[PDB]
Design a protein around this ligand. Structure first.
Ligand code: HEM
Length: 399
């Protein structure tokens, strides 16, 4: 059995691959890791084939994780009922069916025009005020929240209440207790919002959810846990695109390639998704439910195991010269959105936003460049999702 390896919290103000994770990928297909918080250790799968398998093995469950204190990145661990993340079948399917209809390909295309308008409105503002602008604050953070709220069904006077609260995603750390305070507000709002609508119609997430509760399909108590993650989910788009833009802004050649292929950025965006280190650590582990062996290692029942989609996305057997951003790849089967039944609920929605963002920013901010040296951009620390805290930019305004 392999020796327990410590995996400290990453402190790197850049998009570079975590050297600690690299050192693990080369130690073997499976390694035991100990994260900053929680108890003990857990197995870690680095091979694409192994990740894709475990991620799809009925023998590994998520529900059990809620019953323990598996080594994790954060010190705070309080699972909620209704969580898609911690849902095993048949509950997972039950829960998702109540909201899935709002995130389908069709719903997303229907939504695109409204999203473009919301995005153009945000871009109008910075163009009107003039050059100096922090794109994270003025575009990457508010755009997703506005679109998701649209999908969720937030009224109008509630928009600012929900946005402000959601800001509990923090810009790194503006408190902690203030984070639990804000959720005590947002979650109470979700519960009440859902209580009402309990019988109403509309493809609306909160509407549909409230309707599903009135029929005892996804009973109350499960509302917050099921919907919270969705309402806050936009943060992933904010930081993943912040990273994409950072690369475009610090590696001029990438910006150039991007600018030369309007209407054909599909492979470029998927290559950035494959290469970008989206998270600072591993997400939620899965629990062995019946003593299994993987890629030559034996995992005893009850033992936890994390998969690394990042490491997987760099597997030399699936992606030749994995550390190079060559864009245009063959199909490119990266696992940026996960795999299995826990595949990202908002993948399609997140993609539509990403494409709008990149297309609209490149066309509407002529001569876009960082307004400060990249070295001056600090990154999010002590949190799951990685990315630039700010992105000070400037662009052509006038003679
Ligand atoms: C490009 C931006 C995004 C990326 C890279 C991303 C990535 C991921 C990943 C890697 C997982 C974990 C899958 C697993 O459990 O193995 C996940 C789960 C999830 N994501 Fe995202 N996500 C993004 C955007 C979003 C958005 C915008 C939403 C909300 C509409 C969202 C909602 C969720 C939910 C609800 C889950 C839990 C799914 C489940 O366990 O069934 N994600 N995402």
């Amino acid at each position: 059995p392999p020796p327990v390896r410590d995996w400290p919290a990453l402190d790197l103000d850049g998009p570079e691959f975590d050297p600690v994770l690299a050192e693990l990928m080369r130690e073997g297909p499976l390694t035991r890791v100990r994260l900053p918080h929680g108890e003990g250790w857990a197995w870690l799968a680095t091979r694409y084939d192994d990740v894709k398998a475990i991620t799809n093995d009925p023998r590994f469950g998520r529900a059990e994780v809620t019953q323990r204190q598996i080594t994790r990145l954060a010190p705070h661990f309080k699972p909620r009922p209704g969580s898609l993340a911690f849902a095993d079948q048949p509950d997972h399917n039950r829960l998702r069916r109540a909201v899935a209809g709002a995130f389908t390909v069709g719903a997303t295309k229907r939504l695109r025009p409204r999203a473009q308008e919301i995005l153009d409105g945000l871009v109008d503002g910075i163009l009107a005020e003039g050059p100096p602008a922090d794109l994270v604050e003025r575009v990457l953070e508010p755009f997703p929240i506005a679109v998701v709220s649209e999908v969720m069904g937030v009224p109008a006077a509630d928009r600012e209440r929900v946005h402000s609260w959601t800001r509990q995603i923090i810009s790194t750390s503006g408190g902690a207790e203030a984070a639990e305070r804000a959720k005590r507000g947002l979650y109470g709002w979700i519960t009440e919002t859902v209580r009402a609508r309990a019988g109403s119609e509309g493809g609306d997430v909160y509407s549909m959810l409230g309707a599903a509760v009135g029929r005892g399909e996804v009973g109350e108590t499960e509302a917050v846990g099921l919907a919270g993650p969705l309402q806050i989910g936009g943060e992933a788009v904010t930081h993943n695109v912040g990273q994409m833009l950072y690369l475009l802004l610090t590696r001029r050649e990438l910006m150039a390639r991007m600018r030369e292929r309007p209407g054909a950025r599909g492979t470029a965006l998927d290559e950035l998704l494959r290469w970008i280190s989206h998270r600072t650590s591993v997400g939620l582990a899965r629990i062995a439910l019946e003593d299994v062996e993987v890629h030559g290692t034996r995992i005893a029942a009850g033992e936890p195991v994390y998969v690394s989609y990042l490491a997987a996305n760099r597997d030399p057997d699936v992606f030749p010269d994995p550390d190079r951003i060559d864009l245009d790849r063959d199909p490119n089967p990266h696992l940026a959105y996960g795999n299995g039944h826990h595949f990202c609920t908002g993948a399609v929605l997140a993609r539509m936003q990403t494409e709008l963002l990149v297309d609209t920013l490149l066309e509407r901010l002529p001569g876009l460049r960082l307004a400060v040296p990249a070295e001056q951009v600090a990154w999010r620390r002590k949190t799951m999702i990685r990315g630039p805290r700010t992105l000070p930019c400037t662009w052509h305004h006038h003679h």
